[PDB]
Amino acid sequence: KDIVLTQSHKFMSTSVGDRVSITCKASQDVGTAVAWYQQKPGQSPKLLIYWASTRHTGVPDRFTGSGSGTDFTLTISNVQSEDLADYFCQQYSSYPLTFGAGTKLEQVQLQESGGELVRPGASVKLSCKASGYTFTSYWINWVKQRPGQGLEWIGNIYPSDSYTNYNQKFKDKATLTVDKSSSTAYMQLSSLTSEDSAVYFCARWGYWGQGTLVTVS
């Protein structure tokens, strides 16, 4: 059974200066293979914490993470205006990678392209141009985010040899490939329906692309 992460507060209210804690409980033991992300409207998720309690490069000391096993916590000590955003936990213990549903608090580069209007039933090809690091040394992941909804992992690919892993839910709907020469990863989706309309992100450890919007209509 897929690992389910539960963040019990879709919304949390706070005031500038306050301390806030958001929790995430895993349906299964995930060791400390948990990451926390911040995401603001119209922007891509930003990595805050990984391995449950390690702060990512450039994240203010205001953010701390803790926990192991099934219970994890993200704490922001002295809330600032710029911290008002959605927060998501994610586990990377085993496939399929999964995310919590989100809590709304109130030189590496990946450039995506390809998103547009597409006719139902047809196919679309999304691209993700990687730069600023060695393309063949990091797994590239693709994630789907339907407007106003949460994150769903589609699958990943190792560029050196194109080994792939797919979320069973997407096993034939999508195919992942790369072009080593231009450092770009691609994802093609077939038999499109409105359930496929969404923003699609490519991401490697630590960095997400800006997202590309696919609209089936």
Side-chain angles (χ1 to χ4, degrees), residues 2-6 24-34 67-72 89-98:
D2 294 355
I3 299 172
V4 184
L5 298 179
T6 301
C24 172
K25 177 123 146 49
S27 53
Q28 207 173 303
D29 180 29
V30 292
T32 52
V34 174
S68 83
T70 58
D71 294 83
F72 302 84
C89 49
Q90 177 229 151
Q91 67 74 27
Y92 46 94
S93 174
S94 54
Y95 298 139
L97 304 190
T98 55

mmCIF file of all heavy atoms in Angstrom, residues 1-6 24-34 67-72 89-98, unseen atoms left out:
data_model
loop_
_atom_site.group_PDB
_atom_site.id
_atom_site.type_symbol
_atom_site.label_atom_id
_atom_site.label_comp_id
_atom_site.label_asym_id
_atom_site.label_seq_id
_atom_site.Cartn_x
_atom_site.Cartn_y
_atom_site.Cartn_z
ATOM 1 N N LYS A 1 0.848 -1.228 0.000
ATOM 2 C CA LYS A 1 0.000 0.000 0.000
ATOM 3 C C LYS A 1 0.864 1.250 0.000
ATOM 4 O O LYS A 1 1.877 1.316 0.689
ATOM 5 C CB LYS A 1 -0.914 0.010 1.217
ATOM 6 N N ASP A 2 0.463 2.236 -0.789
ATOM 7 C CA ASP A 2 1.178 3.511 -0.867
ATOM 8 C C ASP A 2 1.194 4.183 0.510
ATOM 9 O O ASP A 2 0.257 4.050 1.291
ATOM 10 C CB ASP A 2 0.479 4.439 -1.869
ATOM 11 C CG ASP A 2 0.558 3.923 -3.295
ATOM 12 O OD1 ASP A 2 1.234 2.879 -3.540
ATOM 13 O OD2 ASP A 2 -0.053 4.567 -4.180
ATOM 14 N N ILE A 3 2.265 4.903 0.806
ATOM 15 C CA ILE A 3 2.377 5.602 2.091
ATOM 16 C C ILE A 3 1.583 6.922 2.054
ATOM 17 O O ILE A 3 1.809 7.788 1.183
ATOM 18 C CB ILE A 3 3.848 5.889 2.395
ATOM 19 C CG1 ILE A 3 4.618 4.570 2.485
ATOM 20 C CG2 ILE A 3 3.990 6.707 3.699
ATOM 21 C CD1 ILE A 3 6.127 4.792 2.587
ATOM 22 N N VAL A 4 0.653 7.072 2.991
ATOM 23 C CA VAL A 4 -0.172 8.275 3.075
ATOM 24 C C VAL A 4 0.316 9.236 4.129
ATOM 25 O O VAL A 4 0.515 8.858 5.273
ATOM 26 C CB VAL A 4 -1.641 7.929 3.408
ATOM 27 C CG1 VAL A 4 -2.490 9.202 3.400
ATOM 28 C CG2 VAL A 4 -2.169 6.876 2.412
ATOM 29 N N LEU A 5 0.541 10.489 3.746
ATOM 30 C CA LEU A 5 0.999 11.468 4.706
ATOM 31 C C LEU A 5 -0.176 12.361 5.034
ATOM 32 O O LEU A 5 -0.799 12.904 4.122
ATOM 33 C CB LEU A 5 2.143 12.314 4.129
ATOM 34 C CG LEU A 5 3.403 11.513 3.776
ATOM 35 C CD1 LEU A 5 4.437 12.480 3.206
ATOM 36 C CD2 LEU A 5 3.920 10.725 4.967
ATOM 37 N N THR A 6 -0.470 12.494 6.327
ATOM 38 C CA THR A 6 -1.559 13.323 6.781
ATOM 39 C C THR A 6 -1.117 14.545 7.543
ATOM 40 O O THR A 6 -0.496 14.441 8.624
ATOM 41 C CB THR A 6 -2.531 12.527 7.706
ATOM 42 O OG1 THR A 6 -3.058 11.410 6.989
ATOM 43 C CG2 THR A 6 -3.687 13.414 8.170
ATOM 44 N N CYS A 24 2.877 16.239 10.391
ATOM 45 C CA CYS A 24 2.657 15.342 9.284
ATOM 46 C C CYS A 24 2.824 13.925 9.811
ATOM 47 O O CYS A 24 3.884 13.575 10.353
ATOM 48 C CB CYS A 24 3.714 15.657 8.232
ATOM 49 S SG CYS A 24 3.870 14.572 6.793
ATOM 50 N N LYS A 25 1.791 13.103 9.689
ATOM 51 C CA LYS A 25 1.920 11.731 10.150
ATOM 52 C C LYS A 25 1.857 10.795 8.967
ATOM 53 O O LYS A 25 0.972 10.917 8.126
ATOM 54 C CB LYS A 25 0.825 11.382 11.170
ATOM 55 C CG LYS A 25 0.874 9.934 11.636
ATOM 56 C CD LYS A 25 1.003 9.765 13.147
ATOM 57 C CE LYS A 25 0.246 8.511 13.602
ATOM 58 N NZ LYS A 25 0.571 7.291 12.789
ATOM 59 N N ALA A 26 2.839 9.898 8.893
ATOM 60 C CA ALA A 26 2.961 8.886 7.838
ATOM 61 C C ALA A 26 2.240 7.614 8.247
ATOM 62 O O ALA A 26 2.323 7.200 9.402
ATOM 63 C CB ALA A 26 4.429 8.550 7.602
ATOM 64 N N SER A 27 1.592 6.956 7.295
ATOM 65 C CA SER A 27 0.839 5.736 7.602
ATOM 66 C C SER A 27 1.761 4.566 7.831
ATOM 67 O O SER A 27 1.325 3.489 8.261
ATOM 68 C CB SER A 27 -0.100 5.406 6.452
ATOM 69 O OG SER A 27 0.612 5.347 5.218
ATOM 70 N N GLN A 28 3.040 4.790 7.562
ATOM 71 C CA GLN A 28 4.055 3.740 7.657
ATOM 72 C C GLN A 28 5.397 4.363 8.072
ATOM 73 O O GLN A 28 5.660 5.532 7.773
ATOM 74 C CB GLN A 28 4.180 3.143 6.269
ATOM 75 C CG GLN A 28 4.635 1.743 6.115
ATOM 76 C CD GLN A 28 4.518 1.313 4.659
ATOM 77 O OE1 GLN A 28 3.431 1.376 4.080
ATOM 78 N NE2 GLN A 28 5.626 0.895 4.060
ATOM 79 N N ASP A 29 6.258 3.574 8.714
ATOM 80 C CA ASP A 29 7.567 4.052 9.151
ATOM 81 C C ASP A 29 8.412 4.506 7.964
ATOM 82 O O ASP A 29 8.656 3.733 7.038
ATOM 83 C CB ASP A 29 8.291 2.942 9.919
ATOM 84 C CG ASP A 29 9.679 3.363 10.416
ATOM 85 O OD1 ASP A 29 9.907 4.555 10.675
ATOM 86 O OD2 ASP A 29 10.550 2.480 10.562
ATOM 87 N N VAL A 30 8.848 5.764 7.968
ATOM 88 C CA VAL A 30 9.670 6.233 6.862
ATOM 89 C C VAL A 30 11.058 6.654 7.310
ATOM 90 O O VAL A 30 11.747 7.362 6.574
ATOM 91 C CB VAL A 30 9.018 7.432 6.127
ATOM 92 C CG1 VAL A 30 7.749 6.977 5.403
ATOM 93 C CG2 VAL A 30 8.714 8.528 7.108
ATOM 94 N N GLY A 31 11.478 6.190 8.489
ATOM 95 C CA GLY A 31 12.799 6.552 9.014
ATOM 96 C C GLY A 31 12.814 8.058 9.201
ATOM 97 O O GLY A 31 12.009 8.575 9.966
ATOM 98 N N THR A 32 13.732 8.765 8.556
ATOM 99 C CA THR A 32 13.712 10.232 8.601
ATOM 100 C C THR A 32 13.745 10.766 7.162
ATOM 101 O O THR A 32 14.197 11.878 6.916
ATOM 102 C CB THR A 32 14.915 10.860 9.356
ATOM 103 O OG1 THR A 32 16.146 10.344 8.832
ATOM 104 C CG2 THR A 32 14.797 10.612 10.875
ATOM 105 N N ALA A 33 13.261 9.955 6.218
ATOM 106 C CA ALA A 33 13.254 10.295 4.806
ATOM 107 C C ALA A 33 12.049 11.197 4.492
ATOM 108 O O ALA A 33 11.175 10.835 3.717
ATOM 109 C CB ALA A 33 13.187 9.004 3.956
ATOM 110 N N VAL A 34 12.070 12.395 5.053
ATOM 111 C CA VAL A 34 10.990 13.356 4.905
ATOM 112 C C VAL A 34 11.530 14.710 4.572
ATOM 113 O O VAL A 34 12.539 15.144 5.128
ATOM 114 C CB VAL A 34 10.211 13.468 6.216
ATOM 115 C CG1 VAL A 34 9.142 14.611 6.145
ATOM 116 C CG2 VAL A 34 9.499 12.164 6.483
ATOM 117 N N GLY A 67 11.458 14.973 14.153
ATOM 118 C CA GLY A 67 10.701 13.745 14.042
ATOM 119 C C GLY A 67 11.408 12.592 13.372
ATOM 120 O O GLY A 67 12.450 12.757 12.728
ATOM 121 N N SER A 68 10.844 11.405 13.550
ATOM 122 C CA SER A 68 11.388 10.207 12.939
ATOM 123 C C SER A 68 10.330 9.128 13.052
ATOM 124 O O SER A 68 9.479 9.183 13.922
ATOM 125 C CB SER A 68 12.673 9.777 13.658
ATOM 126 O OG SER A 68 12.364 9.033 14.809
ATOM 127 N N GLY A 69 10.371 8.135 12.177
ATOM 128 C CA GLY A 69 9.343 7.111 12.248
ATOM 129 C C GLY A 69 8.068 7.497 11.494
ATOM 130 O O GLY A 69 8.047 7.481 10.263
ATOM 131 N N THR A 70 7.000 7.836 12.216
ATOM 132 C CA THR A 70 5.738 8.207 11.585
ATOM 133 C C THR A 70 5.289 9.647 11.853
ATOM 134 O O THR A 70 4.394 10.154 11.173
ATOM 135 C CB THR A 70 4.600 7.297 12.069
ATOM 136 O OG1 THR A 70 4.509 7.389 13.498
ATOM 137 C CG2 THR A 70 4.863 5.825 11.657
ATOM 138 N N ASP A 71 5.906 10.301 12.835
ATOM 139 C CA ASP A 71 5.499 11.652 13.191
ATOM 140 C C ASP A 71 6.549 12.718 12.978
ATOM 141 O O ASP A 71 7.631 12.676 13.566
ATOM 142 C CB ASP A 71 5.008 11.624 14.636
ATOM 143 C CG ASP A 71 3.741 10.782 14.778
ATOM 144 O OD1 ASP A 71 3.854 9.549 14.889
ATOM 145 O OD2 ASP A 71 2.625 11.352 14.734
ATOM 146 N N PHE A 72 6.209 13.688 12.134
ATOM 147 C CA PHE A 72 7.126 14.759 11.788
ATOM 148 C C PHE A 72 6.494 16.135 12.015
ATOM 149 O O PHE A 72 5.283 16.309 11.890
ATOM 150 C CB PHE A 72 7.553 14.599 10.313
ATOM 151 C CG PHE A 72 8.211 13.271 10.016
ATOM 152 C CD1 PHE A 72 7.433 12.142 9.734
ATOM 153 C CD2 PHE A 72 9.601 13.119 10.168
ATOM 154 C CE1 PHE A 72 8.005 10.880 9.625
ATOM 155 C CE2 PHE A 72 10.204 11.830 10.056
ATOM 156 C CZ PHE A 72 9.409 10.724 9.791
ATOM 157 N N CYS A 89 4.625 18.276 3.309
ATOM 158 C CA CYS A 89 5.648 17.290 3.692
ATOM 159 C C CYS A 89 5.676 16.267 2.555
ATOM 160 O O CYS A 89 4.709 16.139 1.795
ATOM 161 C CB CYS A 89 5.349 16.549 4.997
ATOM 162 S SG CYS A 89 3.695 15.846 5.188
ATOM 163 N N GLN A 90 6.784 15.537 2.454
ATOM 164 C CA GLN A 90 6.936 14.556 1.391
ATOM 165 C C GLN A 90 7.851 13.470 1.935
ATOM 166 O O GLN A 90 8.764 13.760 2.696
ATOM 167 C CB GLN A 90 7.609 15.196 0.162
ATOM 168 C CG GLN A 90 7.849 14.176 -0.967
ATOM 169 C CD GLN A 90 9.246 14.186 -1.545
ATOM 170 O OE1 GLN A 90 9.739 13.159 -2.021
ATOM 171 N NE2 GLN A 90 9.881 15.325 -1.542
ATOM 172 N N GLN A 91 7.612 12.235 1.547
ATOM 173 C CA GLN A 91 8.442 11.127 2.016
ATOM 174 C C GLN A 91 9.177 10.563 0.825
ATOM 175 O O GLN A 91 8.656 10.569 -0.299
ATOM 176 C CB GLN A 91 7.580 10.027 2.716
ATOM 177 C CG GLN A 91 6.565 9.213 1.863
ATOM 178 C CD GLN A 91 7.210 8.163 0.945
ATOM 179 O OE1 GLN A 91 8.294 7.659 1.228
ATOM 180 N NE2 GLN A 91 6.514 7.804 -0.150
ATOM 181 N N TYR A 92 10.420 10.131 1.039
ATOM 182 C CA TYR A 92 11.146 9.564 -0.077
ATOM 183 C C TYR A 92 11.809 8.263 0.392
ATOM 184 O O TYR A 92 12.895 7.923 -0.041
ATOM 185 C CB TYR A 92 12.177 10.532 -0.660
ATOM 186 C CG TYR A 92 13.054 11.263 0.355
ATOM 187 C CD1 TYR A 92 14.309 10.765 0.709
ATOM 188 C CD2 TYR A 92 12.623 12.466 0.934
ATOM 189 C CE1 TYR A 92 15.123 11.451 1.624
ATOM 190 C CE2 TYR A 92 13.414 13.165 1.840
ATOM 191 C CZ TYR A 92 14.670 12.651 2.182
ATOM 192 O OH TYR A 92 15.465 13.323 3.062
ATOM 193 N N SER A 93 11.112 7.559 1.268
ATOM 194 C CA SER A 93 11.564 6.270 1.780
ATOM 195 C C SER A 93 11.359 5.214 0.693
ATOM 196 O O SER A 93 12.249 4.413 0.419
ATOM 197 C CB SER A 93 10.759 5.896 3.024
ATOM 198 O OG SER A 93 11.051 4.588 3.495
ATOM 199 N N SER A 94 10.192 5.222 0.067
ATOM 200 C CA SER A 94 9.916 4.244 -0.984
ATOM 201 C C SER A 94 8.870 4.728 -1.986
ATOM 202 O O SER A 94 8.109 5.633 -1.707
ATOM 203 C CB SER A 94 9.449 2.937 -0.348
ATOM 204 O OG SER A 94 8.358 3.167 0.522
ATOM 205 N N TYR A 95 8.829 4.084 -3.138
ATOM 206 C CA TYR A 95 7.906 4.446 -4.206
ATOM 207 C C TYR A 95 6.506 3.921 -3.960
ATOM 208 O O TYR A 95 6.327 2.876 -3.371
ATOM 209 C CB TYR A 95 8.400 3.884 -5.539
ATOM 210 C CG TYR A 95 9.745 4.439 -5.958
ATOM 211 C CD1 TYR A 95 10.715 3.608 -6.521
ATOM 212 C CD2 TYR A 95 10.018 5.802 -5.880
ATOM 213 C CE1 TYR A 95 11.909 4.123 -7.001
ATOM 214 C CE2 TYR A 95 11.209 6.322 -6.360
ATOM 215 C CZ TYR A 95 12.145 5.482 -6.922
ATOM 216 O OH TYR A 95 13.305 5.982 -7.466
ATOM 217 N N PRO A 96 5.494 4.669 -4.394
ATOM 218 C CA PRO A 96 5.655 5.958 -5.077
ATOM 219 C C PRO A 96 5.947 7.034 -4.018
ATOM 220 O O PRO A 96 5.483 6.904 -2.872
ATOM 221 C CB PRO A 96 4.294 6.169 -5.724
ATOM 222 C CG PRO A 96 3.343 5.446 -4.758
ATOM 223 C CD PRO A 96 4.101 4.191 -4.475
ATOM 224 N N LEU A 97 6.726 8.060 -4.388
ATOM 225 C CA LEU A 97 7.011 9.169 -3.476
ATOM 226 C C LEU A 97 5.637 9.785 -3.267
ATOM 227 O O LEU A 97 4.845 9.833 -4.219
ATOM 228 C CB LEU A 97 7.873 10.235 -4.127
ATOM 229 C CG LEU A 97 9.208 9.746 -4.714
ATOM 230 C CD1 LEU A 97 10.102 10.934 -5.110
ATOM 231 C CD2 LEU A 97 9.893 8.882 -3.638
ATOM 232 N N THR A 98 5.363 10.266 -2.051
ATOM 233 C CA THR A 98 4.050 10.850 -1.753
ATOM 234 C C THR A 98 4.162 12.110 -0.928
ATOM 235 O O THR A 98 5.165 12.325 -0.233
ATOM 236 C CB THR A 98 3.135 9.826 -1.030
ATOM 237 O OG1 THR A 98 3.791 9.339 0.142
ATOM 238 C CG2 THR A 98 2.809 8.649 -1.962
#
